[PDB]
Amino acid sequence: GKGDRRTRRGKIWRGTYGKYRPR
Amino acid sequence: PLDVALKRKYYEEVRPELIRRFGYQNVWEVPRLEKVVINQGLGEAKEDARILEKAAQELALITGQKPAVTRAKKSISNFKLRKGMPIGLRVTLRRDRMWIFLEKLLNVALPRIRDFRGLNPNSFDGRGNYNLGLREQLIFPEITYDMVDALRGMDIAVVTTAETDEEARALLELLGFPFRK
Amino acid sequence: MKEGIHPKLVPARIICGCGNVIETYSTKPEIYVEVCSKCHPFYTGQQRFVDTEGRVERFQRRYGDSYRK
Amino acid sequence: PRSLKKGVFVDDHLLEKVLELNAKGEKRLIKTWSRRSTIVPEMVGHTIAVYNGKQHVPVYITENMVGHKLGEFAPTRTYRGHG
Amino acid sequence: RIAGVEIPRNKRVDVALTYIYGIGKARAKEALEKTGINPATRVKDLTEAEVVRLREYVENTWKLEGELRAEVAANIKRLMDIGCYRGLRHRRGLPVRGQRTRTNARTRKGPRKT
RNA sequence: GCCCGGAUAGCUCAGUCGGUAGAGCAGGGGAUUGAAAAUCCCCGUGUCCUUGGUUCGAUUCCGAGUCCGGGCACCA
RNA sequence: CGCGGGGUGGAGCAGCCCGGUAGCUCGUCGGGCUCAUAACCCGAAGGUCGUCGGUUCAAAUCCGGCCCCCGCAACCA
RNA sequence: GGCGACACACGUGCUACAAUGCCCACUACAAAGCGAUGCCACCCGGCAACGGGGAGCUAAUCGCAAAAAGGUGGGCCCAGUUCGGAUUGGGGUCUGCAACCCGACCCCAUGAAGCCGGAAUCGCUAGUAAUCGCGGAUCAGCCAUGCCGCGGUGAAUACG
RNA sequence: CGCCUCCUAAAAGGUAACGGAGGCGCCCAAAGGUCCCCUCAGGCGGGACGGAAAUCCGCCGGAGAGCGCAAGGGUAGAAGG
Ligand SMILES: [Zn+2]
């Protein structure tokens, strides 16, 4: 869910980028 | 009787080996495998699931021999078990089924043991008799995870003609029992 | 042996996860296994199979000793 | 953790003291205000009264505490439960 | 089946692999690749050569079920031995990573004791 | 010992002169209420004690038995 | 000391006959309502069931001894 | 060092407990602000964080910056789940002099409770609720789910 | 207040006391008959759950177990299973 760093959505809600939220 | 290649190993290797290491002055002095006792202290069908013939089914599949029932030697209060009450299966694996079951045991069951660091090098009766325990019965190739419904381990009593734990663990060692330590 | 109680064994075809065949006598003719002695770690030097480091601690001092002194 | 690109931070004066006693052998139990440094493998075998905020708590340095900060082994808070 | 446990046949291998303790989506997403295995195939939909390929591979890639749990408890065991603050938290069974100990530590403290 | 009474929903009891096992009490839920409530709506659940026989079917009718309750006596 | 009875969670009591599981009310704690308190509601926790021995697989629950309490009696002079 | 404790208790929030959903990929659509030691385009390396380069921007023109939900297709098929992400082990990036108490972020693994919540109780009458995302203040960093705003979709109901 | 066991009770029996102890007012259709087969308690050691004690195994055990119920007697060369 929105609290999952591994989820893209989580980084979205986290407002960051990682392996699962490219830029 | 039929052939069992592991017993063959015993005669071909283990016998001359122990003759070497120990120099038994008569061949009846070398250790031998009396029998393999299979116990399962179920303690479940004592009151409920009274037909745990699935248990004897699994044991028969594992040994080709339907085991014996061990009943309540006397009632107990702390343990919900009155006397005259099935609490455990047991079978006396002998020559053919003995060496067979052992072959399957070393060759399959131990390698299928979870985190199998070996066998206890100290689980010895003292009389040249080794024992151990299991936390499940699905370890064996006959038993599939589908057919298995509940993990019931056991304790296995390997009996040996030898008298000392030194000569005993010598014998099993020759048989290649993977000792944990 | 009580004749008719004992489930009859047969020549047993054991197949390892390595396909290592260990023919024996079992109630089922052929049976597969995920492991054999010839593949189990405890027999093949343990191989470590993931990690041969063997207590990485303590060091393993990589990124260490770069102190200015 | 501190960026390995950056060096392993260690309070030099405390680090230097350790390297000093190294030449002078294990001795001179070091009181330190320097909780923030990381233990260095030289530090093993030494001992330090690490400052806890009010006190310098003696800590013997083993290899099991090399890759850690000094202050970690000096608990700055004293808890004992309730009642 | 595989290293410690069995994968659910009616489920695709993707989640099946992750069911292995010590394997998340990442290694699940990868071992199929290094073993070239199609993830869409259900666990029941798996051929032997695929599985033995994947089995031996993944079992030789990372310690998953038992060996992993060894170091895990080991890492916390070795922590408790040195007496680090982190080890203190474990030996106290309290939130180790700087959590607000006062409230919202039920995940580390379980039931409430009023 | 004799007489007779019932064995039914978790309970109470309906119960065909053989076509169906039901009323309410309890239970739960819904609405209901500030609480208490009551109410209300709806679901709750039975070899119709057992055996039999009859008749197309028997909860019914019936033969037996048991329990079951009472009474009516008698006690060497 | 003669006879009868009793001594269960903090309080009062129940389960004893029939040894397999001890429940109710009050009360405690937490919360709720209130400006606060009481009341009320939600929720939870909470018992060698006198002592000690034997019976029993097992004893509050059976048996005995002891302690305490209660009751009745302790007379014919 | 403490203000970060922590058997506990309350308030206020966020995330959820799933299919009107979740995940993946592509494709859209804003507003409002911010920015010279700051936005940093773009490029490379790196799983990523990010790092090495590096133009423009000195501000309608450079950038932050992608809006997100939405739409297309795919997967999942009711599962404590491809729900849930809590906790924890480990490996890293950045800031900082220094991230042990006491930062954030990335990656791997771990995968907690939780099946819509008693008593009770809150807000809202329209672009409102509800839901989705975006900017700024403080600030090196951020413990911001807060706060102040900005916009997307967008309701039901009012007898009295 | 009747019966059973023990001591009282003095090495036959019996033997009193408001003497010291306890039991019984049944139960088993098998707990009976016979044939065959087995031997316990207990302790150690080893043994998944699993304990102190479940079931297992090996080791030592003359009866100290059991034998429906009080005690006693009897008893495994069985009355025990
Ligand atoms: Zn193999």
Name all domains of chain D by residue range, CATH numbers in brackets: 1-83 (3.30.860.10)
Radius of gyration for the alpha carbons in chain E, expressed in angstroms and rounded: 19
H or E element that contains D18: helix D12-23
- Look at phi and psi of residue D53 and say left if phi exceeds 0, alpha if psi is from -120 to 50, else beta: left
The separation, in Å, between residue D71 CA and nucleotide G74 C1' comes to 85
Read off φ and ψ for residue B81, nearest 5 degrees. -160, 110
Are B124 and B169 in contact by the 8 Å Cβ rule? The answer is: yes
Helices and strands: H and E segment counts in chain C: 0, 3
The separation, in Å, between residue E51 CA and nucleotide G45 C1' comes to 54
Beta-carbon separation of C40 and B111 below 8 A: yes
H or E element that contains B174: helix B165-175
Nearest Cα neighbor of E12 from B75, A14, E29, B117 is E29
Task: Please tell me the distance between residue C21's alpha carbon and the centre of ligand 1 in angstroms.
Answer: 9
Are E64 and E20 in contact by the 8 Å Cβ rule? The answer is: yes
Nearest Cα neighbor of C16 from D51, B112, D23 is B112
Task: Please tell me the distance between residue B107's alpha carbon and the centre of ligand 1 in angstroms.
Answer: 10
D and A in touch (3+ CB pairs within 8 angstroms)? no
| E22: number of Cβ within 10 Å | 19
H or E element that contains D13: helix D12-23
Q: Work out whether strand B88-93 and strand D47-51 pair parallel, antiparallel, or are unpaired.
A: unpaired
| D82: number of Cβ within 10 Å | 5
Three-state secondary structure call for residue C61: coil
Residue C25 CA from chain centroid, whole number? 22
Are B107 and C31 in contact by the 8 Å Cβ rule? The answer is: no
How many Cα atoms occupy the beta-carbon half-sphere of D49 within 13 Å? 9
Whether the CA torsion C30, C31, C34, C35 is positive or negative: it is negative
Residue E107 CA from chain centroid, whole number? 18
Read off φ and ψ for residue E54, nearest 5 degrees. -65, -45
Two tokens, residue C51: 């990690």
Residues in Cβ contact with C3 at an 8 Å cutoff, skipping those fewer than 6 apart:
none
For the annotated binding site of C, the residues are 16, 18, 36, 39
| Residue E93 near chain D (CB below 8 Å) | no
Which whole-number Å values give the CA distances from B32 to B1, B25, B176, D83, in the listed order?
A: 17, 15, 15, 64
- Chain E residues whose CB is inside 8 A of the D64 CB are 78, 81-82
Residue B169: CB less than 7 A from any atom in strand I:
no
Resolution for the entry shown, Å? 3.5
Are D36 and D71 in contact by the 8 Å Cβ rule? The answer is: yes
Q: How far is the C-alpha of D28 from the C-alpha of E78, rounded, in Å?
A: 28
| Residue C44 near chain B (CB below 8 Å) | no
Are B153 and B133 in contact by the 8 Å Cβ rule? The answer is: yes
Residues in Cβ contact with B86 at an 8 Å cutoff, skipping those fewer than 6 apart:
B42, B45, B46, B50, B52, B69, B70, B71, B72
Residue B181: CB less than 7 A from any atom in strand G:
no
Strands (E), chain A: none
Read off φ and ψ for residue B130, nearest 5 degrees. -110, 145
Of E81, E82, E88, the CB nearest to D75: E88
Of C12, C14, C42, the CB nearest to B117: C42
Read off φ and ψ for residue B57, nearest 5 degrees. -60, -50
Task: Please tell me the distance between residue E37's alpha carbon and the centre of ligand 1 in angstroms.
Answer: 21
For the annotated binding site of C for Zn(2+), the residues are 16, 18, 36, 39
Q: Identify nearest nucleotide to residue B35 by CA to C1′ distance.
A: I57
Residue E76 CA from chain centroid, whole number? 16
Neighbours of chain C (3+ CB pairs under 8 A): B, D, E
Read off φ and ψ for residue E9, nearest 5 degrees. -60, -45
- Look at phi and psi of residue E36 and say left if phi exceeds 0, alpha if psi is from -120 to 50, else beta: left
* DSSP 8-state secondary structure symbol assigned to residue B131: E
Q: Tell me how many degrees the CA angle D30-D32-D36 measures, rounded to the nearest 5.
A: 130
Residue D7: CB less than 7 A from any atom in strand H:
no
Give the strand order in the sheet containing D47-51: D30-32, D47-51, D56-60
Q: How far is the C-alpha of C35 from the C-alpha of C40, rounded, in Å?
A: 6
Closest-CA residue of C relative to D15 is: C69
Which whole-number Å values give the CA distances from E89 to B160, E101, E109, in the listed order?
A: 51, 11, 11
Question: How were these coordinates obtained?
Answer: cryo-EM
Residue type, E6: E
Two tokens, residue C20: 């290592």
Q: How far is the C-alpha of C38 from the C-alpha of C61, rounded, in Å?
A: 37
Give the strand order in the sheet containing C30-32: C21-26, C10-15, C30-32
Residue B65: CB less than 7 A from any atom in strand I:
no
| B28: number of Cβ within 10 Å | 8
Residue type, B81: L
**Range list of H helices, E1-114:** 13-19, 25-34, 48-61, 66-82, 85-92, 106-109
Q: Work out whether strand B33-40 and strand B88-93 pair parallel, antiparallel, or are unpaired.
A: antiparallel
Taking the stretch 134-153 of protein chain B, residues with Cβ within 7 Å of any atom in nucleic acid chain I are 134-135, 151-153
Give the strand order in the sheet containing B68-70: B68-70, B88-93, B33-40, B154-160, B130-134
Q: How far is the C-alpha of E8 from the C-alpha of B45, rounded, in Å?
A: 30
Two tokens, residue B101: 């079951």
- Chain E residues whose CB is inside 8 A of the C58 CB are none
Q: Which residue has the tokens 């109630």?
A: C27
Q: Which residue has the tokens 């063997």?
A: C54
Whether the link from the prior residue into E112 is cis, omega within 30° of 0, is: no
Residue type, D5: K
Are D41 and D16 in contact by the 8 Å Cβ rule? The answer is: no
Helices and strands: H and E segment counts in chain D: 1, 3
Q: Which residue has the tokens 């440094």?
A: D37
Three-state secondary structure call for residue D67: coil
How many Cα atoms occupy the beta-carbon half-sphere of E112 within 13 Å? 4
Which whole-number Å values give the CA distances from D63 to C25, C38, E87, in the listed order?
A: 54, 38, 16
Q: How far is the C-alpha of D19 from the C-alpha of D13, rounded, in Å?
A: 10
